[PDB]
Design a protein around this ligand. Structure first.
Ligand SMILES: N=C(N)NCCC[C@H](NC(=O)c1cccc(O)c1O)C(=O)N[C@@H](CO)C(=O)O
Ligand SMILES: N=C(N)NCCC[C@H](NC(=O)c1cccc(O)c1O)C(=O)N[C@@H](CO)C(=O)O
Ligand SMILES: N=C(N)NCCC[C@H](NC(=O)c1cccc(O)c1O)C(=O)N[C@@H](CO)C(=O)O
Ligand SMILES: N=C(N)NCCC[C@H](NC(=O)c1cccc(O)c1O)C(=O)N[C@@H](CO)C(=O)O
Ligand SMILES: [Fe+3]
Ligand SMILES: [Fe+3]
Lengths: 347, 346
């Protein structure tokens, strides 16, 4: 029994899996949809990005599962910090990697080492090409992790909840669509402004019937557009992504499992009060929003596609509630209770 | 015909030569129109300019001794104006303020003058400076036949204010400093006089400040208690005064005959008062003095600039209100600028 991963490579499905290696820690999100009430039972080790770049969601899982602290960290937050030696001594029976991100890619040496060691490697993608790859990735993870039921259940849930948006936005003509700029990790990078091109959160803008102003400024899924180019284009809608912890007075939007609506809106406002940004038509008109950054690499990204549609056409999606979708998602699939703020509107 | 600041229609006289000033310090608006002949057309005025602006008065007297012979229609209050002395001056126009030390739109004297066939014009630099200062000058221009001087002054004013507002109009509320202005600080019976939504409050608004008394008061002027100031503990403290140097009464010395030393020394007395002296703004040195009469004068662009430099020192490093003042005097007035109209604490 073989399968085609997101890198086009054929992978032989292991008879039994009990030692999953996560190339990128936040790939846990895809795994969590399959493992039910035993989320960490089969994880031998992971990249440190989930523990260090998702401190809020981490803490919530730790309070219910303290054994999460004992899962080995194969590195910090970059592919280059992964020791291939520590990886191999964990004797994984499968390794899950992302086409892009803070972990090894299809051409890394570690991938070749693992192939020499007889360890199946699966490439998924929620980051470069979410629209093409999210559902195929879950289908594949289902097959190789022996959780076809959970995967098929989640695909049905996802397709249905996305179809609620696309049934409407797929028929909207281009000239009625709002222009949109998404500023990733707004306020929190050295150089403004990170954003998404034809890929990443750009796919969400496309699906939600928006017009991404960076679509044709950038060759890749991620890139950089200068502040003045944003000011010049003066888009209808401004969106900032962040995942900053509540009690961090550094610049950035606070969003995540431990963030209250008050902190999300107070910190979004700081972001919108920055020189230049604050003269945007979208900011002055109040079409300014915050979205949780890690949706940029998670099959929970249907929550962001829905939040986008409701910001792009408020009345046409008055009846749609992403909080109900998150709650249906958590209750049906996860082992923790939903808390915090994953998106916010300016007041 | 023109519409004054009270919404009333006034038939502009064909020729004006006998101007009555309901409030003496309305002279300031007139001075911008009369060039080198400032007092030529004034038949009489309220005594507030002569008695509450002794410094600016003395400077004009030294160059124009005939100013002493302009009749005083009263002292410093509307109720002290003899309507009889007013009418025997046979004015051909009367200029009054919506508020202040002179008659308002509903006074008996205004009705008497209407019965006597005398045009009355209401201006305002005091209640709503932001709304009213420029419209007031436009109107005075038309009724006094000095449209050129008025239009020249409006252009000067707008340009010098726009230097501030083009910056501060884009600043968000959460980056603005909190400000308290204490009018005639030290000099009132009960502390502390200040401005609400109006008067010098308009200047704080324009200069991108946050007036702590904006929502404490219903009117343009009022009073807030010392303890309320201490409790709000604002970023920036400003005291207004116009006291003459050789006046042993309490208050801040500012005006045409005041040196920076006298201004600095007398501001310090004001800042050394119990309670005031523990303010964060005073301890941090964000404490300032502004000349009181800017509370009712179209020269108020000088204060708006002084506030802006105090509210954002670097963003207005290059802006100099002394140069604005010098340009104003040379272009419009008949005397030489002297003295200290603003001061920073040592
Ligand atoms: N801390 C580092 N020096 N690198 C992190 C590695 C991944 C890098 N990340 C981004 O470009 C990025 C942009 C916006 C928001 C984010 O959260 C990001 O992580 C990256 O993506 N590299 C690309 C190309 O280098 C890749 O691996 O495909
Ligand atoms: N590829 C790069 N060189 N920079 C882009 C990303 C690297 C780094 N990312 C994060 O810190 C991060 C945090 C939370 C979630 C994520 O997905 C992240 O990538 C980053 O942004 N560094 C800043 C330095 O402050 C920068 O590049 O300006
Ligand atoms: N000497 C008096 N009794 N009254 C003065 C007349 C005007 C009175 N003035 C003030 O309240 C005032 C406050 C702070 C600083 C100043 O320079 C002031 O003149 C006043 O404003 N009256 C109001 C209410 O009647 C008005 O004229 O509408
Ligand atoms: N409304 C009042 N009763 N008093 C406040 C204003 C009256 C008087 N004003 C002045 O002395 C004055 C001086 C220079 C410039 C001005 O505009 C002035 O108004 C005043 O302040 N009286 C004090 C006691 O002296 C007071 O009434 O608190
Ligand atoms: Fe990242
Ligand atoms: Fe007064």
């Amino acid at each position: 029994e073989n399968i085609t991963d997101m890198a086009g490579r054929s992978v032989v499905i292991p008879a039994k899996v009990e030692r999953i290696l996560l190339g990128e820690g936040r790939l846990f999100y895809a795994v969590s949809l399959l493992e039910g009430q035993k989320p960490f039972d089969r994880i031998v080790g992971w990249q440190g990005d989930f523990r260090k770049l998702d401190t809020q969601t981490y803490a919530v899982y730790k309070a219910k599962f303290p054994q999460v602290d004992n899962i080995p960290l194969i590195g910090n937050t970059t592919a280059d910090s992964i020791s291939p030696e520590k990886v191999l001594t964990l004797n994984p029976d499968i390794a899950i990697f992302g086409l892009s991100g803070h972990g090894p890619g299809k051409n890394s040496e570690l991938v070749k080492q693992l192939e020499k060691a007889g360890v199946p490697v699966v490439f998924v993608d929620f980051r470069t090409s979410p629209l093409k790859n999210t559902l195929p990735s879950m289908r594949v993870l289902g097959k190789v992790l022996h959780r076809e039921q959970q995967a098929n259940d989640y695909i049905k849930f996802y397709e249905d909840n996305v179809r609620k948006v696309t049934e409407i936005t797929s028929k909207i003509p281009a000239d009625k669509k709002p222009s949109v700029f998404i500023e990733l990790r707004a306020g929190a990078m050295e150089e403004c402004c990170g954003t998404a091109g034809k890929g990443n959160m750009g796919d969400f803008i496309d699906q939600a019937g928006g017009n991404n102003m960076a679509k044709n400024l950038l060759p890749g899924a991620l890139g950089t557009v200068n502040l003045e180019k944003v000011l010049s284009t003066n888009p209808d809608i401004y969106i900032a992504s962040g995942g900053k912890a509540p009690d961090n007075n550094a610049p950035g939007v606070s969003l995540g499992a431990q963030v209250t609506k008050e902190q999300a809106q107070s910190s979004l406002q700081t972001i919108l009060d920055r020189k230049g940004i604050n003269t945007l038509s979208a900011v002055k008109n109040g079409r300014s929003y915050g979205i949780w950054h890690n949706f940029y690499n998670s099959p929970y990204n249907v929550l962001a596609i829905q939040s986008f549609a409701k910001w792009f056409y408020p009345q046409q999606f008055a009846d749609l509630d992403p909080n109900n979708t998150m709650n249906s998602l958590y209750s049906q699939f996860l082992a923790i209770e939903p808390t915090g703020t994953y998106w916010v509107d300016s007041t």
